[PDB]
Chains A and B, each alone.
Chain A
Amino acid sequence: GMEINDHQLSVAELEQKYQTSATKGLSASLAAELLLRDGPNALRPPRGTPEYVKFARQLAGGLQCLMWVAAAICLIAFAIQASEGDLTTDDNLYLALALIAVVVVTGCFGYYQEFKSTNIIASFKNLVPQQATVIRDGDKFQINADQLVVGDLVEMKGGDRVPADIRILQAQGCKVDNSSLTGESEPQTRSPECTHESPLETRNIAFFSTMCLEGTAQGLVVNTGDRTIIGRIASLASGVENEKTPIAIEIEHFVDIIAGLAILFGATFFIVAMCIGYTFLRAMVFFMAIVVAYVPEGLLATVTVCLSLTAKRLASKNCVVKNLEAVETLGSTSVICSDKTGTLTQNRMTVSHLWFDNHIHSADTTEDQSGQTFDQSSETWRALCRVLTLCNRAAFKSGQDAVPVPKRIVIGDASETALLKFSELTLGNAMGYRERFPKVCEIPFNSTNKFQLSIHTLEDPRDPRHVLVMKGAPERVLERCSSILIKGQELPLDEQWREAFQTAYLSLGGLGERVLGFCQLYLSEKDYPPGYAFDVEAMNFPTSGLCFAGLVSMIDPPRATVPDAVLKCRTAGIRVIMVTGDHPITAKAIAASVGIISEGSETVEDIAARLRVPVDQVNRKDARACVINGMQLKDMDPSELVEALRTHPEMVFARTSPQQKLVIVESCQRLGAIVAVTGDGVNDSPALKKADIGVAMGIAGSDAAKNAADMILLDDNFASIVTGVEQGRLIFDNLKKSIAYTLTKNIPELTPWLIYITVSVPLPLGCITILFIELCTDIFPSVSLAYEKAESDIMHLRPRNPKRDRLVNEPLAAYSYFQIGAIQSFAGFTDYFTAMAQEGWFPLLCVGLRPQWENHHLQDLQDSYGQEWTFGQRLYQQYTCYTVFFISIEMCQIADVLIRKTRRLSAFQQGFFRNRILVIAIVFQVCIGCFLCYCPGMPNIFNFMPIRFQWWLVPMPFSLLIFVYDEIRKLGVRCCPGSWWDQELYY
């Protein structure tokens, strides 16, 4: 009952169904009752969750929450420690603060990812008329559009938009634009006649928001508001549940791994702490420290900086993203569903073929005229060109000489518009040529005549003849011809010619193209003197026994770059499906033209006509291609749609409703596809909202289409999709490189605390310094891995299995966390005991030393040599410990970022230095280091110490070891691609 049946009702029933009059409309009272029952004739705007509740969710998350807890412990500790008058550590204040900055600064990164921040129903009620004329109690007047109610009697005209979903009762030459439903701006006729089962195809339903191109009609309002077909398209778009992009899923998964590990580590040692005799309040502070050490505070930040720089790169190819997540998705996409008109095609009727001289020729239908033309040496051709040029009434608006001919705006229907553009492309200036042959007489195209004719003075001064030129439907042009132009000579139209013609006509018909015949007849001066008075109402001229010249056929042709883009995608393992509202025959022709259907693919219908067998005996597997109309789709079951998708790898869905587009996208999704969707129209918005990424054309796109998109091709260059595929596959490959590099240093920030707790050595690595490494020193190096190039031939690889190929996996985590990270902690501790001993504290003295070390009532503690030490002097030496541990990690992050440059390939072939941005990041890394060390004051602001050259050298053999270890590892997998070594130790 959501569904319109009112097209199949009599007036008696429609009047009974609505308690209305088909000629006097609703009673004024019942109108205002019904208005209270149904509400206004308007689309309800589903409020997007308010702007700041959007920002609150960013604050939450596995990593965000641990920071909260840690900042809270820092406050609680700060309060408890200061409620006993201990003013000695405001570290637990500043630690608390910095954490909160990080939580908030991180949450800001997440929220400003969404540049667009807009609601779709805004564009939808910009498609809606503000006024309507209605009749109630037999009084016609202009009402507000929103006041209409089902049952209202409504009068439409050309120029005005249709005020509701209307069941048409009477019409006078009335045509509408249904492109918001079908994507097709071709005018459709509205009558009161019931011409189809579907109300989407019948003539006596007119649709809310569609534009009435011409004529007039009256009809009954059978739906209003969100019940109208535009209101349902809108609902489908708004009501799509907000599912997570492929990379959001990946980020969440890695975060879940980290947060789980952090709670486990923090909680087991809290126990261990309490078990070896610490006070609960101190173990609570260890839990905070372990969390702060293990969690990568800078990680999510680095990830979105990498996405930012891919978004930057895409945008320079005129490919504009609306949310940083959308910058990855085309790399993970495995099925593209594409609207045909204005996406694949130019949305412009273009001359495509010509039948003359008994042969079909192919015109160059590209927008840049970059294609293959047809032979124009023929004198049959010079003649046909004369006819299609003179017999045309369309016009270029002036001053367009700077414009490319295809872009030029012309006054005329699509057909004559195409013919005129075709003629100016073929010959210099069609309007100039036409003026040389002055139009003596003319009859425009008619419904009764079913052709268009005009007679013309000729250009030669010497030649006094009058040439008659005519076009119309080919069969009906031909039934008025007696001869035909063939190879210069003119022959009587014998049976063999008439049959030749019919096959050509039906041939171009089969290519989903519109077809026109074109004939001429030269009038002598003997029967028609130079000043003969050609009178249209007299028919004083002939309209039979003309000379046939040729057929011309036209189609909305592919955009020039679109067919190569499609092969590139398929080459990269992506399935490509056509999903259009246009008619199947055109859709299939264009699918073939563009590469969606490979040369040699047959449908089961194709096979059946070759083998001359019924289709029900064709084995469905044998057909590589398939064309399913919306009616069939409506009839199918989901198991059947799936069965079709699995069976025919080259799939065309034509004559589909907006919901049917959604249902196809979703079907692919349930099957396991990451689905992209390329469209330019209002009817695409549900399919756009529901894809994992939606791409709109920037120029020929509709607002609703651009609003529901995640990505916008600003120049309409479909080939940009191919770029997106690549950049996506790169950014994913490179993110695991930064993530691997950023995670690996977490382990040597952890282990110092684990040892400190369990061994009571002086504290090796403090929090303030970790944050410096995490949020400052290593930030640029991790980002620079974004710039890394592809190790493999990325465009020939299949799209990644979303279920088994993840951004962070156990092999990547274990190797980075427990091998490279472990080497880094052994370096740290080696430099720690090195700097302690060279300063008077032998390692055995450090075990259990912590209590006395950290005692402010102990100003003369003795070291290994017997030297007595103040708490102050000990404190600064503790800072020296923090610093050596810091620079051990930094020196290893040089080795680390180098070995992360490649996951398969050795650093000796790709080299070390081709990535320019990475080496500046390494150099900035070491500069920000020397500053923190040797800038004066640094020991008292940030706890950093001017270490000696020797302790920079100490961890270098460990860094070198890391390089050599990984290099050996990577060679192992190149030389044994199936072995255990490869299985277990490749990340």
Chain B
Amino acid sequence: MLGRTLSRWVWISLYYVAFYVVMSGIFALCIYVLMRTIDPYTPDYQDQLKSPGVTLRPDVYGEKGLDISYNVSDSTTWAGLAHTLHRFLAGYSPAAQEGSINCTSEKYFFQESFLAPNHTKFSCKFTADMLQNCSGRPDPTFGFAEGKPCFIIKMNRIVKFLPGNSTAPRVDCAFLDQPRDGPPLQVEYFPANGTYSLHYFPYYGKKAQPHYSNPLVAAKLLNVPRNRDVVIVCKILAEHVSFDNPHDPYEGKVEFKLKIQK
């Protein structure tokens, strides 16, 4: 015997396994009830999503954040940055956008009925050519070969989030520390002003807009000096976007080290 007899061992096992089945059943039921609680289109609460995050491409991380460094003289130092930039843009090709539609309103694209196919709502097209000089055409080196690179600023989507009506949310990139010896960060943004059209909002969730694609803005940095380490902060200027959070550097802004070697 290892604590009981061979029949006392079986009768306790049967009880514990019974206990465990019933409790697993009660649990499985709780989860099931929970899932008819849940609407597949709009989340119940958005507590951690008060302000949208911001990301950039190409995302290359060192330690402690985004660090991007390449040699203009060597084409092979920026090849991968181009490559990830091109490879990211593939979902924004005219064919990739076959599920979205032409949006002209330049106002919030509110939809209540699901008139799009398979009982969904329509989503607005955003095609890579809307980034113009930073679309990979005619310059497939996306600004890098010439020492004036493009970074694309993407605002994290959030269901029914509206960023403010008075204008479209805009990107602004400036140096984090204005250099005492130098002038402000000079940048041209595509589309003009660096705006996200209002009709890309609200997001209605992957189930309602499966073909939804985030509008982008490219930030063509024109000013940045060679062989010096800089830090660039791109903030979203929108009424309901904040970038003040000290426990989330990516809330409402994105910052990156940049060095352009020669």
Contacts and interface: CB of A to CB of B under 8 A. Distances in A.
Interface of A: 85-87, 810, 818-819, 822-823, 826, 829-830, 833-834, 837-840, 842-843, 856-857, 859-860, 862-874, 876-877, 880, 940, 948, 980, 984
Nearest to B65: A856
A872 B157 contact: no
Residue among A830, A865, A866, A940 with max Cβ neighbours from chain B (10 Å): A865
B45 A870 contact: no
A841 to B, nearest CB: 9
A872 B212 contact: no
Contacts of A860: 53, 55, 154, 156
A842 B38 contact: yes
Given A866-B205, A866-B206, A876-B48, A822 B23 contact: yes
B40 to A, nearest CB: 8
Contact of A837 (B3, B35, B46): B35
Nearest to A873: B48
Interface string B149-162: 00000101111000
B248 A839 contact: no
A859 B250 contact: yes
Contacts of A830: 27, 30-31
Given A830-B27, A838-B45, 8 more contacts: A837-B38, A839-B48, A840-B43, A859-B54, A866-B157, A866-B203, A867-B159, A984-B15
B88 to A, nearest CB: 12
Residue among A819, A833, A866, A940 with max Cβ neighbours from chain B (10 Å): A866
Contacts of B203: 866-867
Contacts of A868: 52-53, 55, 156-158, 214
A877 B35 contact: no
A843 B35 CA distance: 9
B48 A865 contact: no
A236 to B, nearest CB: 42
Nearest to A834: B34
Contacts of A819: 19
Contacts of A869: 48-49, 53, 156
A842 B20 contact: no
A865 B34 contact: no
B228 interface: no
Given A859-B55, A865-B205, A872-B251, A833 B44 contact: no
Contacts of B157: 866-868
Nearest to B155: A868
Contacts of B158: 867-868
Contacts of A87: 64
Contacts of B43: 838-840, 863-865, 867
A873 B27 contact: no
Nearest to A984: B12
A868 B154 CA distance: 11
A826 B27 contact: yes
Residue among A85, A856, A880 with max Cβ neighbours from chain B (10 Å): A856
Contacts of B38: 837-838, 842
B207 interface: yes
A837 B250 contact: no
Tell me whether chain B's interface is mostly helix, strand or loop, or mixed. loop
Contacts of B207: 865-866
A870 B34 contact: no
Contacts of B48: 839, 869, 873-874, 876-877, 880
A856 B207 CA distance: 27
B245 A857 contact: no
Nearest to A823: B23
Contacts of A984: 12, 15
A752 to B, nearest CB: 14
B101 interface: no
A872 B248 contact: yes
Contacts of A877: 47-48
B46 to A, nearest CB: 8
A867 B49 contact: yes
Given A839-B48, A873-B53, A980-B11, A940 B20 contact: no
A870 B47 contact: no
Given A838-B45, A877-B48, A833 B31 contact: yes
Nearest to B206: A866
B53 A865 contact: no
Contacts of B12: 984
B110 interface: no
A810 B3 CA distance: 10
B247 interface: yes
Nearest to A860: B55
Given A822-B23, A869-B156, A872-B248, A842 B35 contact: yes
B61 interface: yes
Q: Considering the complex of A and B, which 4 residue pairs feature the smallest CB-CB distances, nearest first?
A: A866-B206, A872-B248, A868-B156, A870-B53
A862 B47 CA distance: 16
Contacts of B254: 859
Given A838-B44, A857-B61, A877-B48, A818 B16 contact: yes
21 contacts: A822-B23, A830-B30, A833-B31, A838-B44, A838-B45, A839-B47, A862-B206, A864-B43, A864-B206, A865-B43, A865-B205, A865-B206, A867-B158, A869-B53, A870-B53, A870-B250, A872-B245, A872-B250, A876-B48, A877-B47, A984-B15
Interface in B1-46: 3, 11-12, 15-16, 19-20, 23-24, 26-27, 30-31, 34-35, 37-38, 41-46
A72 B54 CA distance: 39
A856 B47 CA distance: 20
A134 B180 CA distance: 102
Residue among B53, B206, B251 with max Cβ neighbours from chain A (10 Å): B53
Residue among A863, A870, A940 with max Cβ neighbours from chain B (10 Å): A870
Nearest to B24: A826
Contacts of B64: 87
Nearest to A985: B15
A857 B59 contact: yes
A843 B31 contact: yes
Given A838-B45, A862-B206, A865-B43, A870 B251 contact: yes
Nearest to B38: A837
B63 interface: yes
Contacts of B54: 859
A526 B47 CA distance: 123
A840 to B, nearest CB: 4
Nearest to B249: A872
B114 to A, nearest CB: 16
Contact of B53 (A85, A859, A980): A859
A866 B203 CA distance: 9
Nearest to A85: B63
Contacts of A818: 16
B34 A833 contact: yes
A873 B31 contact: no
A637 B247 CA distance: 81
B243 to A, nearest CB: 12
A880 B47 CA distance: 10
B84 to A, nearest CB: 13
Contacts of B31: 830, 833, 843
A542 to B, nearest CB: 90
Contacts of A829: 27
Nearest to A87: B64
A871 B156 CA distance: 12
A843 B209 CA distance: 22
B55 A873 contact: no
A826 B207 CA distance: 30
Contacts of A980: 11
A85 to B, nearest CB: 6
Nearest to B210: A866
A857 B43 CA distance: 25
Contacts of B156: 859-860, 867-870
A106 B133 CA distance: 68
Given A867-B159, A872-B245, A839 B44 contact: yes
Nearest to B53: A870
Nearest to B245: A872
